[PDB]
Design a protein around this ligand. Structure first.
Ligand SMILES: *[C@@H]1O[C@H](CO)[C@@H](O)[C@H](O)[C@H]1NC(C)=O
Ligand SMILES: *[C@@H]1O[C@H](CO)[C@@H](O)[C@H](O)[C@H]1NC(C)=O
Ligand SMILES: *[C@@H]1O[C@H](CO)[C@@H](O)[C@H](O)[C@H]1NC(C)=O
Lengths: 441, 103, 441
């Protein structure tokens, strides 16, 4: 028997319903999300990390000169410095004083830390949505399975088949371009490959961590060696990856709306409380008992014994009843005014039972579906005393949830009074027009 | 069998089973004489631009009809307004120049 | 020197221009696309292939009975058939006449052909655009390289830095869902995983060709064994993969607009003639020669000796000239009226040279640039003789390209005559209007 409904996109808050099959007693259904994951499709654009400058041994030509050549090394530099007279531990290196030449070479390569400490530039596309759902129905215990939130792909959960509609909102916390560094995700509009600037995020770019084609843009300039000294000095713009680490700011992990949690394997946004989720679950036929085989309840009287519109189940109610067969009975409240804590109660031939509920209303009024029957519960709820709590509200507030009886009294009098006063004027206006008419006629 | 395909300047590609696809393009070789007499000019542009020529010719005729009717209507209106002052005055000068411009 | 321009998204039709660096003689530039590839991002959804039904040996219980159990196999079927009296080569298998049961089992597997003969269902997202660009300039021979058509990433081609702008059209021949079978790509809204119907494309679905979790949806039903025979008969819906292969229809390879060619490694659409391509090329400073160092060309006179507005270089023109310091001189037509076949000519102190051109215009009038100089070429072109050609047009057709001098004359008379008629009517109205005034006054 297929039951279709729309549940809020909330984690930890159970969706409760009675599955009403014609000719059979209602089956209580409880669907709760364990987690919800937005898993976008990503394509690695390039990998950024701190660069290393490789400086091969210089060529020192005594009594002569050399010429530089072009090489494919990233950010390759080569310069010939004439007029050198270097010294080493063994004395003067060259014979000639000013006729000697030193060739300096340098190029940029990925550092060793790039294997572990690097930032991944990704382009992000719409992917898939998956969830872990905890379901119990009737007398069957909780069962759970990982499901795809497509609205078409079914999942088997404890002999029940569940299909979950797509999220009502296509919202995703990830931008079109993101940077993943460590455990953090940044909505960073990174430069395209090959356009990185020196001292900025993309100064060094590589398609992969093992790629042999490395892009490097640093102002690497070879300097003249110190007089009498053999070395290869140079200047270069400090790494833009190290600078980015200092200035990267707040990650998406800390700014994502709706309480999204960001995870990387796979990249996904978890538990984003956005919109609502259509659901369709097939309850197995064996779960239903014929109405004639279940208890019949009558003369239900519901009393609200204590109520506070706190986030927890602050409402307490007592229902007096008489019942045949003294059996078990599902309990439900189809109205959105109150959420019922208990799923079912044990009935005797006669007596009363209590149940707990959570409501936002100052004057709640709700229908309690005692199996095959119903009783209307009404009462007055007090304000909660605790200002801040560490748990989410079990209920949903509406536009009129806070309006008290005294508030309605004033609204009714003010709206009714002004309307009646306007009408009174119009009535007098119509009558006087007729009074003048009768004077002439 | 014989199959006929329309090919324009944009080109057409056809693949005969297990053969490499072949691409062909049509040149502006339609029949006509754009430098000839009006019946030859219209034929050339009709063959090269069938729909545009039909729409173009209708627009030309519609413009001519509206302009010629309006031109003659104003000229007829001119004669009525120009001559009437003399119709209502049998004993009038009626200069000879009037009989040449307004008639 | 950086040269910026826009070239059409055409393959095999070269883009020609003269790079004019102030103070230096023009450098002829020619950019030709070898191929353009739209390479979308794809996510494999599942793999479809023909199924195999696995039928283990049936359990034949003599003088007794057995019971079926569920198993974690795709489309698993199990049924116990009582009242069997099977025979083998050695005679009656069971002793009892009717107190015997056969338990039949069957389930669906991927066939051996699934490793080579299968269809891949992909989700297709915007990816990248790449092209092979063939470039020559000045006296530099043709050089080519693969480039990214995004307007950001530069390419170094023969010491020239090339940036190819993004395509003006974001058009792509692939829908959000495609099926790749063999070498063919189909735009097909395949069913979501786990929702395929029996006898249709998705009756058998696998996330990957080597997975151990297979979805199968066939009406596999075990039938009662024939009397006295040990075997496992069953009925099943014919494979929907074989059905699809019969009813595939035309692939995207055969219906893609704009002449796209579909390739699979990686999946891409090649040579789609959509929109235009902004370009920017930085020409080496060594490729430019100063004006005072190049020949001076004067007294130019251009005569069209033959012309037909065919798709090939049907035009022939002869240019007389006087010059100095005989040497090579680039030739270019800046207007779109005619495409010049020759890129440069050798000039003597005086003489003439010929060049070929392609034009769609019946009365072409175009400027010809001869290094540092220019001449105006005019003439009449005859219609082409060939109705169909196997090569694309070199020229570009304009709205007014087909209008002859005779057609313009008729249009001029049409508008002039039409206006003259109304003008006479308005003049007559104004003259009579004044006369009517003078009559009263
Ligand atoms: C489902 O809920 C029950 C009780 O609420 C809990 O014991 C069980 O662990 C839950 N399942 C999952 C997967 O969290
Ligand atoms: C194709 O065109 C020719 C004209 O040359 C005509 O004779 C023939 O009947 C046409 N064939 C078809 C199938 O239309
Ligand atoms: C580039 O053009 C030249 C001449 O047109 C040709 O020989 C060469 O093969 C072309 N290169 C490519 C990669 O097509």
């Amino acid at each position: 028997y297929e039951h279709t409904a729309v549940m809020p996109n909330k984690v930890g808050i159970p969706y409760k319903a009675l599955v009403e099959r014609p000719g059979y007693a209602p089956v209580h259904l409880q669907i709760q999300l364990v987690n919800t994951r937005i898993i976008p499709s990503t394509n690695l654009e390039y990998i950024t990390c701190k660069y290393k400058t490789k400086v091969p041994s210089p060529v020192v030509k005594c009594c002569g000169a050399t010429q530089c050549t072009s090489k494919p090394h990233p950010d390759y530099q080569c310069q010939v410095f004439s007029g050198v007279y270097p010294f080493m531990y063994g004395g003067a290196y060259c014979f000639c004083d000013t006729e000697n030449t030193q060739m300096s070479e340098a190029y940029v390569e990925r550092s060793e830390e790039c294997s572990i400490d690097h930032a991944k530039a990704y382009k992000v596309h719409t992917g898939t949505v998956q969830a872990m759902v905890n379901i119990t129905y009737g007398s069957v215990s909780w069962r759970s399975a990982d499901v795809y939130v497509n609205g078409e792909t079914p999942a088997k959960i404890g002999d029940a088949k569940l299909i979950i509609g797509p999220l009502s909102s296509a919202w995703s916390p990830f931008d079109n371009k993101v940077v993943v560094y460590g455990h953090e995700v940044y909505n960073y509009d990174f430069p395209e490959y090959g356009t990185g600037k020196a001292g900025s995020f993309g100064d060094l770019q590589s398609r992969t961590s093992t790629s042999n084609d490395l892009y490097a843009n640093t102002n690497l300039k070879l300097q003249r060696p110190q007089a009498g000294i053999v070395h290869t000095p140079f200047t270069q713009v400090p790494s833009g990856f190290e600078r980015w680490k200092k200035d990267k700011g707040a990650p998406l992990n800390d700014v994502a709306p709706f309480g999204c949690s960001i995870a990387l394997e796979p990249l996904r946004a978890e538990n984003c409380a956005v919109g609502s989720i259509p659901i369709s679950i097939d309850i197995p036929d064996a779960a239903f008992t014929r109405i004639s085989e279940t208890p019949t309840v009558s003369d239900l009287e519901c009393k609200i014994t204590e109520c506070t519109y706190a986030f927890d189940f602050g409402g307490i109610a007592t229902v007096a009843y008489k019942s045949s067969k003294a059996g078990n009975c599902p309990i439900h409240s189809p109205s959105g005014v109150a959420v019922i804590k208990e799923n079912d109660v044990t009935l005797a031939e006669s007596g009363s039972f209590t149940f707990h509920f959570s409501t936002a209303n100052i004057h709640p009024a709700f229908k309690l579906q005692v199996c095959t029957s119903a009783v209307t519960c009404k009462g007055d709820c007090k304000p909660p005393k605790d200002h801040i709590v560490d748990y989410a509200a079990q209920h949903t507030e509406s536009f009129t949830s806070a309006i008290s009886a005294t508030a309605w009294s004033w609204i009714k009098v003010l709206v009714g009074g002004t309307s009646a006063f306007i009408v009174l004027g119009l009535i007098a206006t119509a009558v006087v027009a007729l009074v003048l008419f009768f004077h002439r006629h | 069998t014989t199959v006929n395909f329309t090919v324009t300047g944009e080109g057409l590609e056809y693949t005969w089973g297990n053969h490499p696809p072949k691409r062909v393009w049509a040149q502006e070789s339609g029949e006509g004489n754009p430098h000839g007499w009006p019946h030859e000019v219209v034929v050339y542009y009709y063959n090269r631009y069938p729909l545009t020529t039909i729409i173009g010719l209708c627009t030309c005729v519609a413009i001519i009809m509206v302009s010629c009717v309006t031109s003659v209507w104003l000229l007829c209106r001119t004669r009525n307004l120009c001559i009437t002052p003399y119709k209502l005055a049998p004993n009038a000068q009626v200069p000879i120049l009037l009989a040449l411009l307004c008639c």
